[PDB]
Structure formats: C-alpha cells, structure tokens
Amino acid sequence: IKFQRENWEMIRSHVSPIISNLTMDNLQESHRDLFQVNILIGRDIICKNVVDFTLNNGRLIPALSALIALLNSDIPDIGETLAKELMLMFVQQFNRKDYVSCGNILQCLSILFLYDVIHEIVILQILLLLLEKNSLRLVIAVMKICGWKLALVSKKTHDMIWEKLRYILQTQELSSTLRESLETLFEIRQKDYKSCENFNELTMAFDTLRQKLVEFKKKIYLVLKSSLSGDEAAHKLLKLKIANNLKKSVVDIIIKSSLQESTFSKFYSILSERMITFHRSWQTAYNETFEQNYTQDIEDYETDQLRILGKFWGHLISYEFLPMDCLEESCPQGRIFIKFLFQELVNELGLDELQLRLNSSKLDGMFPLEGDAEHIRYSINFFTAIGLGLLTEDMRSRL
C-alpha cells in the first residue's frame, strides 16, 4: 500500500512537471513523457494536473484538450472524470462570481466538445445559463470557441442561441461592452469562425497499452531551344513553376546548354536576367550554381566552353548579380575563367568604373588588399597578363 502511495505521489509530481513544461516548442516530447508515466491508478492526479494547467496556460488549452481526447480514446473513465471536474469548476465559478475561472473552464469545455470528448448538450446548457443572467462576456468567447462545431452538430441549438443573442441586443437595454460583444459574435457567425486491490494488474495493462502506442532535363532543353528570344524561354520556364528544389537543377541545365553552343549568346544571359528579376529563390539558385562552378565544375570544361561560361557570368554580374566572389594553388582552368569574366566586365562597364564598382563591394578574393608576404604578387602578375590597372598601385601601397 505504501509503495502504491509512493508511486502515486511520484506520478502526480511528474504530471505537475509536464504541466509546467507544456509549450509549442516541445509538445511532442511532453506527450511522450506523459505516455511514459501511469495514469489509471493515478488518474485523479492526472486530472488535477490537467485542470491546474488549464487554469494557469489558457493559451495552450487546445493542446490540453487534445491530450485529454487521446487519453479518453484509451482510458474513457479518466476522461469522463476530467469532464465532471471541469463541470464542477464551472459551476463553482458561476456561483462565486469567479469570472476568469468561468472563462477558462468554458474554454476547456469548448475544446473538449471540438475534440469529441464531451457532448454539445452541456455547452448548450451553459450558454442558456449565461443568457438567463444577462452574461454576454461569458457566453461570447465560449460560443466563438465551439461555434463551427456547434453548427455542425446541434444546428437548431445554435440557431436558438443566435436568436436569444439577437433578442438581448434589441429587446433588452444592454450595456456598451455587451453590445460590442454581440456585434463581434454576429461578425464571427457571418464568417463561421475564421480564426487498490488490482494494482499489479492495472500496471501490467498500462505497460501493454504504452507498448502498443532526365525527362525533366530534356524538357528544359527543348524549352530553351523552342524559343526565339531568351525572354520567351524564361517565360516558358516560369510557366512550368517547378519547385524550389529543382530551380538549381534547371539553372545547371541552362548553363550546360549555353556551354554546348559554339560561342556565348546574349539569349541565355537574357533568360537568366529574367529569372533573376522574377524571384529571390531563382537568384539563390543562380548563386549556388555559380559557387558550384568556380569551386568544383570549372576545371572539367574545355577552353572555349569555359570562356563562354565566364562571359555569361560576367554579363550576369555586370548588372544583375551582386559582386560576391570567392577566389597560388587555384590557377589553371579557373584562372582563365576568371580572366574571361574580368574581360567581360571590362567590356560591359568601362575600366575605371568597373574598378570603382569592385572597390565598393567587400571583394577580398579578386583583389586582396593586405600584402600577406608577396602573395598579392601572383595576383598582380595575373592581372598584367590580361590588360588591367590598380594592381601596380596596390603593390606600391604594400612595398
């Protein structure tokens, strides 16, 4: 008996802890925890915990209701007991002018009704009671909570309630607040709620219960090639409305297509621009593609193709893209690609202007400012290889 008592005590504590915890961030975990502990011998304790919680977060009443429903589905007696307790609480509230308590209790009841725990008859009765004493503040929120459900189940009852409310509004000298409440209710209606001896055996039972509880690519290619201007192609692509997953893939495909053509075409660039303007996700995809290229896919290409790619990227970056670029060891294909890109930029912009633009962005990779023990020499040399300025100045600066 002592052992049993101890167990019960433990259970109660656990329940309390759970109640304290209960929130949106860790609800599943809480549920799991609850499931772990027994609540047949400690059913009363569980009920107490639940009710207390309700009294406390009222904002997490729905969750509580759900939990109750879950419990009830397994152990119905407990649920019934809980319901009874709630009813009692409500009654007490009604008696003692404990308005907050009533509101809480009412809310709980509504939640229960919604989750198929308690019948709507009780709710109706409550509403009637509220009406009899001209209490608009109590029944207004409750109704809202269990409005749609009420309509679904006891439509006649709902209608009656509405009628009563109307009567109160018109055929009774109501207060301002009351009137407001009534109005709110009406509005809601218009939209239809838019917002022991056998202890061991029992234990055994509970444990048991616990235990129990290419084609696409082809299509893209076709689209690219079945289109006069790039604009048209872009439009076609957008029509498809492929998921934010596949955008990157699409971009890659486009790039490949571009590479395949003998020399760099404005078309692809135009298409890219169109895509980029259209949405942030496409921009992101483009960025990702770019990253992939210079990092891992650049060294695979033959020279002409690489050059073309660079040109395309330059075009993209001359206007549309932000100049964000991540650049001794890394110098074969990649270096030539970079050179090509630079050339493209120069062509688009104008040398001094281009330089200024570069300066404006953070740009540590393309032009590292800090001397870093003759590491910038290499960069300078590279720059010299493809007619450019400012390198000399940089060199002078460091000495």
């Binding site: 079945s226 201007s229 048209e232 075409s265 404005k266």
Partner: protein, 107 residues
C-alpha cells in the same frame, strides 16, 4: 532568311508573323495535297520528323511564342516585351525547336 539575319530577326515582329503565316501556308500546301487540313490528322510529327523517319523534315520557325505588345503604344513611342501571342499551333506540349537557336547570332 535566318542565316542572313540571325540576330536581327528577333526584334522585328512583322517578320515573325510572316514566318508563322508562311510556315502555316507551307503546311497547308502539304495538307492541300491530302485534301483535308484537319488539324488533328496532321500532328507536328508528320512535318518535322526528318525524312530519315519518313517525315517531310521541315525546319520550323513557327512554334515561337511571338512578342505581342500594345499596338497603341508600339508604333507610337516606346516598347517592351510583354504579353506573348500564340505562335503557330495547338501542341501536345510538343516544343518543336526553332532554327534560330541553332544559328550563332551575327555579333
């Protein structure tokens, strides 16, 4: 037409329209031979399929979604590419590629 002005086609809408019309006319010629022109009985298969699979092997420039525009504001003043017009046919989502995309623009 296309090899001579590769780049310069894209902008001119009248030319595009003519191409669409011309292509259609050509198609109908073939369909005239077969004494019908019922649009279902000639799916693009029979025209654009190459001769090496028994088709006519045309080289379309018609399945382009033509640039439409505010003809109010087109001839007048300034322009931008908005609202595409139909292009040439009902398709079974069969995007027939266009000769232009296989010709390297003059620049």
């Amino acid at each position: 037409l296309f090899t001579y002005f590769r780049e310069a086609i894209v902008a001119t809408e009248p030319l595009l329209d003519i191409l669409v019309k011309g292509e259609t006319r050509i198609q109908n010629r073939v369909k005239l031979g077969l004494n019908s022109k019922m649009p279902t009985r000639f799916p693009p298969a029979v025209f654009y399929t190459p001769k090496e699979l028994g088709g006519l092997g045309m080289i379309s420039a018609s399945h382009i979604l033509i640039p439409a525009s505010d003809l109010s504001w087109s001839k007048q003043t300034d322009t931008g590419i908005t609202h595409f017009r139909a292009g040439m046919t009902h398709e079974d989502e069969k995007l027939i590629p266009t000769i232009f995309r296989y010709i390297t623009t003059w620049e």
